[PDB]
Amino acid sequence: DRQPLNPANIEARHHGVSDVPRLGAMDADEPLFVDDYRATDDEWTLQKVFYLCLMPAMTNNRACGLGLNLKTLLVDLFYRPAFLLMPAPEDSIAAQRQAVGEMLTELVEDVATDAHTPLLQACRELFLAVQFVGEHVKVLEVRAPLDHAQRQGLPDFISRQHVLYNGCCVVTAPKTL
């Protein structure tokens, strides 16, 4: 937002628990919603290697970042009686396609279904991960003075740096979404 995130403006996400007020704040920017986990130094370095060195070398700057409006996306995608009335069906694929919806049909069907897993079983298996939903895409501004050896000349240079949160790195424009 305008000001740096204070330690109190960073909120922990409660997964597996009803969190409607957080879901109302999906597009809110003042509080930042996070998991409990904090990336270690080692995996921080590896993530930087992957995104700054490997990906632009292999793509030649062809990647881009996007965010999904996953509130309405997940609502109109999963708010079927098939997913709300999940039993604790092995019909024909036509009835499965109708039940699961057009978008989930063209998204999942040939991609994640085997002869052991019809369309609706695969879509139920995907539906489970919805319980960890998270918020909408954000862009954060990172400010950092350099280390004490680089800071010596121009001590007042506050570097600034932009990152994508709740976002994706994409190599294609999604047709279906």
Binding site: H15, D35, Y37, E43, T45, L46, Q47, V49, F50, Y51, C53, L54, M55, M58, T59, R62, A63, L66, G67, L68, L70, L73, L107, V108, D110, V111, A112, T113, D114, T117, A122, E125, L126, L128, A129, V130, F132, V133, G134, N166, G167, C168, C169, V170, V171, T172, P174, K175, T176, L177
Partner: protein
């Protein structure tokens, strides 16, 4: 030598028919271990089918998913060659370090 895995990665990340649900499951998982372990059987079937039906290595567009597949989906589930491709991507990251 990681040149064959990098050729496969090159064709994957520059392929216009890269599946659209990979981004959705990426933004669902956040790089959370538990969200992956719930979707774990789903993504394994997805990667195997997308390797056989087209010559690409899906979920290679994100660091979180590739490293989660490397760590968790190595107990079987994946065929050994497909798993070795993700293992080799992680080995490339270590070598850059």
């Amino acid at each position: 030598d990681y040149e064959e895995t990098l050729r496969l990665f090159k064709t994957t990340v520059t392929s216009p028919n890269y599946p659209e649900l990979c981004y959705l499951v990426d933004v669902l998982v956040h790089g959370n271990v538990d969200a992956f372990l719930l979707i774990r059987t789903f993504v394994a079937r997805c990667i195997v089918n997308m390797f056989h039906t087209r010559q690409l290595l899906v979920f290679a567009h994100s660091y979180a998913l590739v490293t989660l597949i490397a760590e968790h989906l190595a107990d079987g589930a994946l065929p050994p060659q497909l798993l070795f491709h993700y293992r080799n991507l992680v080995a490339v990251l270590r070598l850059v370090t």
